[PDB]
Symmetry: D2
Subunit: 334 residues, 4 copies
Amino acid sequence: TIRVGINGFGRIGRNFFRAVLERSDDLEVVAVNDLTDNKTLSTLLKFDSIMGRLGQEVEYDDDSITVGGKRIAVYAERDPKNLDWAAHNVDIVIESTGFFTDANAAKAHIEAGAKKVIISAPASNEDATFVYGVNHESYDPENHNVISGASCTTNCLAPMAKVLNDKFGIENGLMTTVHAYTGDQRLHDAPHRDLRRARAAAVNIVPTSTGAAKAVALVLPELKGKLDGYALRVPVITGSATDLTFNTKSEVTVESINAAIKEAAVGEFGETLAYSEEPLVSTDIVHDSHGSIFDAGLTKVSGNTVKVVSWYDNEWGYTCQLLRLTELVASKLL
Amino acid sequence: TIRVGINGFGRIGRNFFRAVLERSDDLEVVAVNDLTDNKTLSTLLKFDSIMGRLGQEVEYDDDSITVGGKRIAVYAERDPKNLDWAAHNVDIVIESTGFFTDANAAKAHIEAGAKKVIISAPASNEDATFVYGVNHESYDPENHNVISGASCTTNCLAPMAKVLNDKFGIENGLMTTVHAYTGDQRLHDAPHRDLRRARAAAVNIVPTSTGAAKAVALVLPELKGKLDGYALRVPVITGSATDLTFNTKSEVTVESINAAIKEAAVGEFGETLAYSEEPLVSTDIVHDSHGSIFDAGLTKVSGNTVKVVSWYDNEWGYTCQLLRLTELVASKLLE
Amino acid sequence: TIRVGINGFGRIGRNFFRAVLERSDDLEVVAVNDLTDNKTLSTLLKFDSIMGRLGQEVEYDDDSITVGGKRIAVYAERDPKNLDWAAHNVDIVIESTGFFTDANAAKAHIEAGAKKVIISAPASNEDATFVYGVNHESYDPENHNVISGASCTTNCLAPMAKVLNDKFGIENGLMTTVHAYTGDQRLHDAPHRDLRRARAAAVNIVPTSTGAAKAVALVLPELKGKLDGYALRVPVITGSATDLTFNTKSEVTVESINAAIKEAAVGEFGETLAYSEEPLVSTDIVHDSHGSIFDAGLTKVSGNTVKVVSWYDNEWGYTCQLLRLTELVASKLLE
Amino acid sequence: TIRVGINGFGRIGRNFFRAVLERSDDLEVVAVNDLTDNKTLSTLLKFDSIMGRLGQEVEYDDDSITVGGKRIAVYAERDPKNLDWAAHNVDIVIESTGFFTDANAAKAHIEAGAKKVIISAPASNEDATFVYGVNHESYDPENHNVISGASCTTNCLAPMAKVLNDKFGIENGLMTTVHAYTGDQRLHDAPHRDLRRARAAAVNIVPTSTGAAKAVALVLPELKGKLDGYALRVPVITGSATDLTFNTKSEVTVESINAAIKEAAVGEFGETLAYSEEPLVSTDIVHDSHGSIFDAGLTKVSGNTVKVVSWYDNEWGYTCQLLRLTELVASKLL
Ligand SMILES: NC(=O)c1ccc[n+]([C@@H]2O[C@H](COP(=O)([O-])OP(=O)(O)OC[C@H]3O[C@@H](n4cnc5c(N)ncnc54)[C@H](O)[C@@H]3O)[C@@H](O)[C@H]2O)c1
Ligand SMILES: NC(=O)c1ccc[n+]([C@@H]2O[C@H](COP(=O)([O-])OP(=O)(O)OC[C@H]3O[C@@H](n4cnc5c(N)ncnc54)[C@H](O)[C@@H]3O)[C@@H](O)[C@H]2O)c1
Ligand SMILES: NC(=O)c1ccc[n+]([C@@H]2O[C@H](COP(=O)([O-])OP(=O)(O)OC[C@H]3O[C@@H](n4cnc5c(N)ncnc54)[C@H](O)[C@@H]3O)[C@@H](O)[C@H]2O)c1
Ligand SMILES: NC(=O)c1ccc[n+]([C@@H]2O[C@H](COP(=O)([O-])OP(=O)(O)OC[C@H]3O[C@@H](n4cnc5c(N)ncnc54)[C@H](O)[C@@H]3O)[C@@H](O)[C@H]2O)c1
């Protein structure tokens, strides 16, 4: 059992912790770090507006939280220099605070005694970036120490494009993600760096930018220059849909598009990408463990222009992708 | 004063009524029909969850409703055969029940006394179909008697497509409309013809078909077999966005794409199609009278693949188009 | 294995089905009736916007549905006369269409082969009415054949009232329940018997009557003519709160009020009434099996005026009570 | 025309500005102060998720915003010591930032050259507190310089209780306000001082505390000790309902309760309190100018226990109350 620490016990920190309990046999979270007191932190772990009440008991004291009788040590250091992971014999830190996506800031956790860092977001200056099931077999135990799990949206779209480019060829593709609101949006009209994310999120469709499409190139180099896109934030609390419209030189049919996805989405890869012929809505993919759930019924073909649509739980699915990735790093030398 | 009656006084019905009071100096609704009593009708007219309280005063009695002191006759007739438009000298009927989209049923209103019928929806077997500002000049006062105003989505998309086809040439386009939920959806999970519109509307992204992309051919023939799409119904009560992604053989940039729209978004056409660089969100286009408001900031190019995005108040934006059209019909031969 | 059938496989229907699979070792639904086809039914059973995807596998054919490999017969019979429960040897029927709340209609199920009928609602002309945990010991296996499980609100309020009346003595109480919206409300502004339930459910606080406060007498006679109230339907899909404000002649404090509930919220009764000091919000009581979860932190006293607040998952909380009751009926004479 | 400044151009600052344009003939806002840049501020004034697009044109430059051709000067001083109102000849400042509800902090605006301050919230150490239409005739031009408009909820409930106590006598009353969420709540589950306001606001009913009931005593001294209450935050973006349940020694009927409210809600007072026999929902009282809209249909009587219900637009109605109050201060010596 490889021990793990989390820096940043927020939505994604907490999803990850839950995913470890629910989905892993060889990982154990033994310390976290956050800004807030253990009463608040334990309360947020216990109750959850999306995921429900946690199965286990939760107690806290002035320097820990105890979950199902297992003591997790908690800190609150705004500066990760001020931590010590080797104390707790932690081999992997998940950096999920969102304020250390620069790999050269993140390597501090190595300084502070860890052996591997995983960034739960797009990173900069990272040793490598991964969408598990796409480019995971390039992981290099020697030289990939500070690594990125990419973004939710990237983890949805990359699996689907790997498959579609491989069989048909994508000349150019433009994406729209119709996306659950996220917590960096305002509940009432208030100031934001971004004048649209500034608007009341639960009564609006809010267009916003995403690097998720350009970032595919990091995991599918052959697609650099070939994808762009953006997001429509819409009033559901979780669950999103990536809608890609692209050009193929190929001559393609709804049926051949769908058959390729189906053909591909098997064995281990099929745990990252699913194939569905069902009448789905967002609530149907809440708490779904695939990174990309492909909706055969939404495939449209017009001339040499294709539209395909894949679903994702932008919390849980992304987390599960990250967990696969952590498991991999944990299975190799370290 | 051309006189107007309304069959089906629901969302679009009532939007229309208000649009007339706010925006027209030569039209008057003098009668309306639905499936309910005048207490229920007077209430729904007075209080609207989207459009607010109505300015005017509202009284009812056992066969009518009065609004700023003007008596409006009301009927409760499931079947339009049993209606007498001529009793009130109604020229134009807005058919907005969404149950008489076959013009062959809707021509009943003619028999029942009306000279014209305007179906506020995609229709079948109609004399003609109009997106105002796009193909309204081909209106034939003699032969065009039962006509379609097309869908909200088609009123959004067409203005935009015309312009960009005219300038650059569309090979093929695929559309996604992110659309406010509508009456035909279920509040709770419950049976429905469409197994997705069957799911809780206000907590779901709900994909469903729409033919508004194919329906563009009806108003721009040169685009037949060239456009398709679908909708995602989402939890807002009104406001939608039309997302189109097309190929052109032309060589294009974000700037030139946007320059085309801004060039054309002027004069009378600019009252149907608008050009914006503002940082819009859906609540900003609620009660906006344009059929299509173009979001210049959302435009993207990659190779010969282009993405463009236009907003529309699917209730009020659509209704303002339908009124423009009703104003055209009424500016001409009423025989 | 007592066999069970369900008339009306809607929200509460399907909650019930799941409650049986999750929570019972001696019950089995073997047949259900509704107004739809088995494709639509199998879909709505498999995917739920609140309860999530069902664990088991689901197949259908032209007269049934199969769930973890157990065949369940399905009928599409508007009229229960045309039903044959005995064909499948069903003892207990859950009548959950919300269209057969008169026991005189619902006794049809008896004629149609059933020995008992449990109406999942306030009923009229019923043999008896039960809030489990409150007055379920007065169940008469011979004479109580068509029975009510009362409303969700009454299942929330009664446990709580009993306790506080028993300890302090209620003069009069007035209740407000802040309740998740329900199927009988409109998604868009549209005609309805109730002119407020007629308004857009998911963007409105909607006041409406409920008799759950008066209905408490049926299960606690000593409170007749002593309680009243109303509901505010608000935009969540499930989860509600019952707010009661009463007089007592006793002298009371926040602490003693709360001490009464905690004292009583134990053993079997504690499975209906819960005691919490947690910082609850509505999503925290979704999928909670208690009929009434008491929020100790919400309690207020001013003179002899007391305010108390209890939570309830109006779908799943209510359904767990209805199952307790169905479990009681089935532990006894089935003649 | 009395000139006015606003400190704090947020929800309530902006509602107030709009109310001046829409409802006043003898007030002119000529300066505001806020944290943010004029581009962001002008954008928020222009577009509004609740109130709609503003009727007028809006331009901005590096030190002002211009509305319908009228230049409003804008500042951004975190510390109101750093301002000068007499420069712009401002007679009344509305303190609406929410971080100067202490009257001894607020009197700075007087230091900085103003003559009257109005706090748009419960205050501490204030010269007086007012619910216009209840205790406004006690305003003392000489000695009421730093004053409070009370809270939205107080402005709903005080008018209704003045009437009901006067005719029936309230022994004791407990309130629940079913309240639109406010912007001090979290959009996603995140830390808050208050563990319930910490929870996703648009998918929850969130119980929270309010002083609004105890505060009635400030405007109706005869009711001290006699009222308490709390709030249920619910997912509508504006519009709320005060539900009061109380004891009367009197012997009362639905009909006599309603007739008293109706009887009272006339002339000027009836502009603060309305009487309604209509089938209202929250959206019906959006943008309603009364502080309290009394819902006759919701009156319940059981023994000597009464429940009455009054609506309020917790943004706009409260604002309009505040505007009446400002108009009063503006009509007297100053
Ligand atoms: N849809 C999603 O939510 C989603 C999906 C994929 C990736 N991501 C990415 O994952 C990351 C996690 O974001 P989140 O949604 O969990 O955010 P969140 O705000 O909900 O939670 C993050 C937590 O980090 C804590 N924090 C902030 N600064 C800190 C610091 N210096 N030290 C320690 N703790 C600190 C906060 O208190 C908060 O509780 C972000 O980079 C985000 O972009 C989010
Ligand atoms: N976003 C929009 O709402 C939108 C936009 C464009 C077009 N439309 C189309 O306009 C039509 C009306 O839509 P709506 O949103 O007003 O729906 P709606 O349900 O609000 O309007 C229908 C009204 O007509 C009444 N009605 C139904 N059947 C009737 C009958 N047989 N005879 C008389 N009255 C009858 C109903 O009771 C209701 O009051 C639909 O076809 C719809 O697709 C809607
Ligand atoms: N919060 C709750 O939902 C709640 C709580 C307690 C009690 N109840 C009561 O339970 C009853 C059912 O409520 P629901 O929420 O499941 O509503 P629902 O509409 O979800 O359930 C009704 C189902 O029965 C079907 N049906 C309708 N008429 C029928 C008929 N004549 N014959 C056969 N099937 C028919 C419908 O198609 C639907 O599938 C109502 O009386 C309701 O008041 C509901
Ligand atoms: N329902 C309501 O919204 C409501 C009703 C009645 C009273 N109130 C009260 O009125 C006050 C106004 O709150 P709001 O809802 O407008 O809040 P808000 O956060 O929506 O807007 C307040 C604005 O103040 C600005 N601000 C913060 N600190 C500042 C400072 N030091 N200097 C200058 N500007 C500063 C912020 O940038 C923000 O834009 C609060 O005390 C609130 O409790 C609110």
